[PDB]
Amino acid sequence: DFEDGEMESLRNAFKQMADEGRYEEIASFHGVPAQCPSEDGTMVHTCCLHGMPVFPHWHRLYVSLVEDELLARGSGVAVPYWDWVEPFDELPRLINEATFYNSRTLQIEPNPFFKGKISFENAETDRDTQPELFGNRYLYDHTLFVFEQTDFCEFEVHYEVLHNTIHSWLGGRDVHSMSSLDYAAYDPVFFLHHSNVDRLWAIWQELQRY
Amino acid sequence: LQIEPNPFFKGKISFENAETDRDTQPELFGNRYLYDHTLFVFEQTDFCEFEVHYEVLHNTIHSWLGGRDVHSMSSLDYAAYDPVFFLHHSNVDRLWAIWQELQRY
Ligand SMILES: *[C@@H]1O[C@H](CO)[C@@H](O[C@@H]2O[C@H](CO)[C@@H](O[C@@H]3O[C@H](CO)[C@@H](O)[C@H](O[C@H]4O[C@H](CO)[C@@H](O)[C@H](O)[C@@H]4O)[C@@H]3O)[C@H](O)[C@H]2NC(C)=O)[C@H](O)[C@H]1NC(C)=O
Ligand code: CUO
Ligand code: CUO
């Protein structure tokens, strides 16, 4: 439901976040350079929480964080949710094409949402979209069964497996992509994904109110 | 076993330190008029009559493929640096080829 203005402003704000240091600094919270030794600690682990019921919470905050700094970079709107529950013949416009036309500069420029840079390994996030991603309506039924959940933890497990799905379909075969937990955050679509996931959680909460 | 950059996606213009880009005009998609255009190109008995319609027809795609960017297919200057160029022109050549054989018939 975006407009050309909102999209170009989102692209620009995020760009400002991108050529400067920041977004990588945020993606490193989830990503492969590990920061979390515990409990003694004997070894170090990645910081993001994934087996636990507090998986949503964590990632919830993640999106919050990035959106905050997005807005502070002059974004007209907060981070949108990309609803993949509805089947699609193509990828969303914002993230799909490698280059967008800049109206203000009157020139074609690289879409910041196409790929994120991983400079500490001197690589870039790539995407190999599995054909299973395009057009399947199974996600509808799956989210439906996620919402059925009275208990919070049942909710959480189905919620998070369902969330794993998109990661897998989108960044399938490359090592530096959405599919591998280590490098998943560096691909901007991450928060575009995890806001949407968050939305689902939000809905459930409201359902629970009912 | 890894995903790599497509060589055909963009050519690089290193003497001006840029890369070819593409702003695809919406008319390029689902254009069925090109059919009839080509048909009128074939109709020509004389060579120059063939050449002019053939080449305007050829200009069409150049224009609509890399429209708005300066370093692109649309500008005659940098059009060659986009790989699609020969992919384009071979097809252009094919048309001429057909015409040649037509002329034989
Ligand atoms: C809160 O965050 C801070 C910083 O984000 C974090 O401190 C950092 O911890 C990491 C470890 O998780 C440190 O990173 C290491 O730094 C050393 C050099 O100082 C490197 O040698 C390490 O390389 C690894 O691999 C080597 C083999 O190739 C091993 O020999 C080595 O043991 C390492 O496994 C690794 O990059 C980082 O230096 C600190 N930085 C700071 C500012 O202290 C802190 O741990 C976090 N606190 C909590 C409680 O989580
Ligand atoms: O959140 Cu940890 O990545 Cu989907
Ligand atoms: O011919 Cu189309 O390129 Cu000079």
Side-chain angles (χ1 to χ4, degrees):
Chain A
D1 303 332
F2 259 16
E3 307 184 7
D4 184 27
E6 294 166 321
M7 268 184 296
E8 289 204 28
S9 69
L10 195 44
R11 270 169 178 151
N12 175 269
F14 185 77
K15 193 161 208 156
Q16 299 169 34
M17 207 167 169
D19 2 316
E20 324 298 0
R22 245 324 213 166
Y23 180 58
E24 287 199 43
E25 182 185 348
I26 300 196
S28 74
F29 286 4
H30 188 285
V32 52
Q35 307 184 8
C36 296
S38 227
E39 313 163 346
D40 1 286
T42 334
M43 60 286 232
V44 305
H45 312 265
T46 53
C47 278
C48 77
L49 285 72
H50 294 81
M52 292 65 182
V54 297
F55 151 82
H57 306 200
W58 194 97
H59 292 81
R60 159 87 67 78
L61 252 180
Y62 181 93
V63 187
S64 125
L65 170 53
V66 51
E67 98 162 333
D68 201 65
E69 294 206 337
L70 209 44
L71 292 162
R73 293 281 177 168
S75 176
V77 287
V79 286
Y81 63 92
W82 163 43
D83 198 30
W84 32 255
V85 180
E86 178 81 34
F88 39 86
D89 294 22
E90 307 181 339
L91 275 101
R93 306 182 62 267
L94 193 76
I95 69 178
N96 189 19
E97 178 66 14
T99 53
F100 83 113
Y101 176 75
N102 196 169
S103 302
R104 203 80 203 290
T105 328
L106 289 182
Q107 72 170 355
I108 318 190
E109 291 174 4
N111 186 335
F113 285 108
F114 179 73
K115 58 186 178 183
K117 179 172 70 270
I118 325 175
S119 51
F120 88 105
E121 281 201 353
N122 203 338
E124 297 176 346
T125 75
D126 292 15
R127 293 205 276 274
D128 187 11
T129 57
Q130 225 182 113
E132 304 184 354
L133 186 52
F134 294 161
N136 63 95
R137 307 180 58 173
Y138 292 82
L139 294 176
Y140 178 66
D141 301 277
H142 285 188
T143 59
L144 246 74
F145 190 65
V146 174
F147 285 148
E148 269 202 39
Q149 297 317 306
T150 285
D151 187 290
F152 171 65
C153 281
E154 309 282 347
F155 164 75
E156 190 280 322
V157 284
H158 295 64
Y159 176 62
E160 192 195 344
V161 174
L162 165 69
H163 136 259
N164 292 338
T165 302
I166 297 305
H167 282 275
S168 171
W169 288 205
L170 191 66
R173 287 210 292 270
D174 198 307
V175 44
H176 298 291
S177 78
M178 196 90 245
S179 70
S180 81
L181 179 144
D182 299 294
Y183 309 96
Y186 294 108
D187 197 329
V189 191
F190 187 97
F191 48 88
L192 267 88
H193 171 53
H194 262 267
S195 65
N196 185 25
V197 165
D198 179 32
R199 186 182 81 95
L200 286 186
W201 179 17
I203 295 190
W204 183 74
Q205 306 188 255
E206 254 294 319
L207 250 181
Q208 286 293 90
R209 260 190 69 246
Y210 195 103
Chain B
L1 283 182
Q2 70 171 352
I3 123 168
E4 298 175 357
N6 186 334
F8 292 115
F9 177 71
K10 61 188 178 182
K12 76 180 102 307
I13 324 174
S14 57
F15 84 105
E16 284 201 356
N17 201 343
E19 290 180 349
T20 76
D21 300 326
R22 294 199 281 268
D23 190 37
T24 50
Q25 296 303 89
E27 299 156 352
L28 183 54
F29 304 171
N31 182 307
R32 30 180 84 263
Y33 286 163
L34 288 169
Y35 176 55
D36 283 303
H37 279 199
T38 54
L39 249 69
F40 188 65
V41 172
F42 287 154
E43 278 192 28
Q44 304 311 302
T45 285
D46 191 351
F47 178 49
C48 301
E49 313 291 329
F50 156 77
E51 185 274 331
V52 280
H53 304 79
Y54 170 72
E55 196 199 327
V56 169
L57 165 72
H58 139 263
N59 289 337
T60 298
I61 296 275
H62 274 281
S63 167
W64 304 354
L65 193 75
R68 278 188 298 225
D69 199 344
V70 40
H71 307 280
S72 133
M73 193 80 167
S74 68
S75 86
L76 181 124
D77 309 270
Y78 304 94
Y81 290 76
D82 195 325
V84 189
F85 187 89
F86 45 76
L87 268 100
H88 171 259
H89 260 263
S90 67
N91 190 8
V92 176
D93 179 37
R94 183 180 72 102
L95 291 185
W96 179 19
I98 299 181
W99 191 73
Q100 299 195 265
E101 189 112 315
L102 241 71
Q103 287 292 81
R104 250 183 70 247
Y105 188 102

